[PDB]
Amino acid sequence: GLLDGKRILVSGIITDSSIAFHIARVAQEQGAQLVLTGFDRLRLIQRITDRLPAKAPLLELDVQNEEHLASLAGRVTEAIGAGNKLDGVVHSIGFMPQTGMGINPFFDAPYADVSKGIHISAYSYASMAKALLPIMNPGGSIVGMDFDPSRAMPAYNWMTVAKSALESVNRFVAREAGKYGVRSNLVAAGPIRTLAMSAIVGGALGEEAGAQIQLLEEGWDQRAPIGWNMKDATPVAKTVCALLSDWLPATTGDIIYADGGAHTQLL
Amino acid sequence: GLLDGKRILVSGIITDSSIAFHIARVAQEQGAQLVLTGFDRLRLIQRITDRLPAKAPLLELDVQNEEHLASLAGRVTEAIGAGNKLDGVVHSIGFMPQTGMGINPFFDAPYADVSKGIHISAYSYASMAKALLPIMNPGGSIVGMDFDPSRAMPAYNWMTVAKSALESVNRFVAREAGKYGVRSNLVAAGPIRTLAMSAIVGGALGEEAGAQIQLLEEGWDQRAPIGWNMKDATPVAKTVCALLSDWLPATTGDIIYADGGAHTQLL
Amino acid sequence: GLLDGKRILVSGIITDSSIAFHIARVAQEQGAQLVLTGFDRLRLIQRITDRLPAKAPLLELDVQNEEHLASLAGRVTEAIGAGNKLDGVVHSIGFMPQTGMGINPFFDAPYADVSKGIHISAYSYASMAKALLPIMNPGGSIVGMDFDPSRAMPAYNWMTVAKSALESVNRFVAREAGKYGVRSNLVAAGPIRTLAMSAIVGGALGEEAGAQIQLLEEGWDQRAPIGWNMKDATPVAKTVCALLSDWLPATTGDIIYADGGAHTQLL
Amino acid sequence: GLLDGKRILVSGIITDSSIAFHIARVAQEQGAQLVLTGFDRLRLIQRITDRLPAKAPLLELDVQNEEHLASLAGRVTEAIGAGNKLDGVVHSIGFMPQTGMGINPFFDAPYADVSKGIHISAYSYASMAKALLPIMNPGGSIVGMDFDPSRAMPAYNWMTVAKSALESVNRFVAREAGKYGVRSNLVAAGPIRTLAMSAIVGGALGEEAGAQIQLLEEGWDQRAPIGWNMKDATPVAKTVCALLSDWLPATTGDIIYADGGAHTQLL
Numbered sequence A, B, C, D: 001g002l003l004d005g006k007r008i009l010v011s012g013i014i015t016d017s018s019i020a021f022h023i024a025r026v027a028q029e030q031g032a033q034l035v036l037t038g039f040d041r042l043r044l045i046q047r048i049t050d051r052l053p054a055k056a057p058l059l060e061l062d063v064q065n066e067e068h069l070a071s072l073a074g075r076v077t078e079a080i081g082a083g084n085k086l087d088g089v090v091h092s093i094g095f096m097p098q099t100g101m102g103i104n105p106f107f108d109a110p111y112a113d114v115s116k117g118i119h120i121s122a123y124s125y126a127s128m129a130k131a132l133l134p135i136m137n138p139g140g141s142i143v144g145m146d147f148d149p150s151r152a153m154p155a156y157n158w159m160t161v162a163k164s165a166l167e168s169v170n171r172f173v174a175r176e177a178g179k180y181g182v183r184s185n186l187v188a189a190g191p192i193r194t195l196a197m198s199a200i201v202g203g204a205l206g207e208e209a210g211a212q213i214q215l216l217e218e219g220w221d222q223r224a225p226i227g228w229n230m231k232d233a234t235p236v237a238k239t240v241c242a243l244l245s246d247w248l249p250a251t252t253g254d255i256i257y258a259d260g261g262a263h264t265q266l267l
Ligand SMILES: NC(=O)c1ccc[n+]([C@@H]2O[C@H](COP(=O)([O-])OP(=O)(O)OC[C@H]3O[C@@H](n4cnc5c(N)ncnc54)[C@H](O)[C@@H]3O)[C@@H](O)[C@H]2O)c1
Pocket: A011, A012, A013, A014, A015, A017, A018, A019, A020, A038, A039, A061, A062, A063, A064, A092, A093, A094, A095, A120, A145, A146, A147, A188, A189, A190, A191, A192, A193, A194, A195, A196, A197
């Protein structure tokens, strides 16, 4: 197994279409022993994660809750056993209020909403690294989920800005993590039909936003030299596992694109 | 004059070493008629701006104050005369609490402080564009000040993250501004010895941060193929005026580097 | 005039739709005194350049001819007068044999053809700088024409590779030019309907290449927040003149995008 | 084994310090069955590769020899057996005549020398893909070696330009390879003390070039958040094997940085 004997924390599962659900499944297939973290709806998340190949302890983590973060390392150590540390951490957490994601004009998102989205989607990558680096082994790996924000796109709006901030945060987390012998990287995924994504395409944020997001997805498969299947998160999950493994040992502060190559082509 | 007959709003003057002070001076030398905006210490700012080549009306603008922003367009129109619109807007506004800029470890900045810095340094670029685009002429130009955040650097810490967000915001502001026939761009400047910058080098945020920032400045002149003079903001001001002029008419959503070429060389 | 009193060499005119024809026209409108260089069909080029606002001396320059390059500085000095130097140089020269530009598969271009295209389109930027820097004034400016090659695109094929090389060459030319107080930059233009470009769209290199290039142009105007008019080279010419002027004095080794902002947006 | 049962062609071994020697060793440790290609000194290369963990057939390949390239697929098939195809191809080939690499000024490299270096270091990536894609399995992987050329650096000179071209070539090879279900990527390595590299630092190309290259290496370990050991090619070899494996299945046309994270930090 690619991750045999590694202890890895995976955040971000909320449904069986969450990217983190597939990260967790593949990591377990590859021999990793997991600790899961979930936000708010913990009975739902437990029921969802009962479908994973192996049972995993589930800890509550609201990344906006300073007490959750202050206690997190102790609760993880309780879950994996004293004297054991983590080898990997997966941040698969993102949120932007509807006002920031195309339900209204870009200029009409109040800063209170934007700042909540940046807190959850970008600052919390540093928050989780601060909490967990003290219980991570040398040679460990922190991975977060990205959506390439180097160019503006319709509808994604302030979530794009949040991903721009996240990419910058990752480069600073790498500086801190390196003192522990730990790498920090993001995986920039192509679009994936999660429940939230499918709802947007179905018009949950208005018809214009849904039409714009559907056009975004279609251009992706067209541009990608190997194609892109938005209904299949497994290639993204495998890429996360590659970064969690020992096989990218000189990559840190960086971004790996699991997008079919779409960002390398113009059309 | 490069800007003859243009009406241009310039924010961001606080001392005679502010980058915006030199933007304002050069723009006036080039025939522009200015409206200035200032934050908090308006009697100080009036005294400072009395040294500009020409008298300019001074309006109060705290970019975190929604009432200041809601009234801004009406106060500008009162200053330049009914029936007149703006041709240019300069955003030269930046702030990050000391906790986010190296006085303590990167992980120790509370999010309340980071979010204040992102509000002032990044979100407010969209706020000012929202307020002023309705009173801007076609062919107009919005320019903001940037510091290249594509790579992490010591001490700048969360201000770097804020500039990453600002660059993303600029690309979305360009989408909105284009509907008015207006361009939006940033100028990424090399380091400039403002009063705040000199205080940091002198140790205002701790000795380690001061030493790191001094090393940053020295490498800049070394890398720049034409050199870099941190005591001279005039080349930065001229570049801002180039973007305010009609001579970069097909550039928008973009970043112009006024850094001596330092970002194009490794050593 | 933006370029009043400046002496500027402009290469690359072959028809009245050449980008260099419009660079020359705008520069002369702005007070510059020009020296033109032309390749191969010098009687045609003289007839074309008779339509410029002012008469300009025309010198022969085949950038693959080492004797043309060795004599160039002396012939320029003869044209502008002993004791006078150049303030600006415009490289607007590009060529790739048909085998490298979509008339056949990418893999079927022989290296002899690719190397000719790289010689003319990329190496010659260094060749011209080597020949002309000894007769350039401090504060001078060298500008070359670019087409953003950061992502692959259909049909452009090995010309894209040549532009990737040119961008790298420009960063090294900036190092050399800086010793003379001279800047070196490229302007990355959106697509322009030159005679050669119109012929390709009309099928001169095969129907597939023409269809692919037409689709490229259409996406450009769609993406550009201020639009893109492929029939109007004047915004590109003005941007070149901005770099030739004194108003971007701290930019070198760099690329300015005169593309309507299209490269900053995904869709 | 990460590469168990995969058939992989590895070019570029010339000494036991070649990056390709360590790629080959790690791939064999991970279960791959290799075919090696060597240039010019085939008895030397056979003696060198006798030290690999397993015997591998050695084929002659001068990438400037069209007959070598035309016969290559047939000779590989003869080596691995009819009915078998390749799963991986490693391009670890680079050369620039001394005139292009700092023994003289950048402007003094004749184009004949530059074009030879671009032929071997960039065009040949397309040449090898053209020859070998017809005998590659779906799900296969082509990997080439890169040195980040996004910024100019002293002494590397025209080799940097060649790497800029190679990166562009890789994006087009990905388009072609995708039709076969094959990925194409580069690994951008930090500096490695090969025999050629050590000779340059020792002054083989002049004292100035040696001093500049030594300063380049030292800044790399300083910038890298996890450090950089120029005497250890194993992290680079492991990264190549990661791209040859099935664990980066949605990455193509791309660049993976095995440089300690140095390119993500300014200082
Ligand atoms: N779906 C895509 O197209 C796509 C593409 C690239 C990247 N991503 C990124 O992948 C990550 C996972 O998103 P997803 O697509 O799987 O959607 P998802 O809705 O399945 O997962 C989002 C997760 O964020 C978590 N979260 C929200 N607020 C939280 C908080 N205060 N504390 C802790 N967790 C919180 C949710 O509980 C949920 O588990 C996100 O960073 C997303 O931006 C998604």
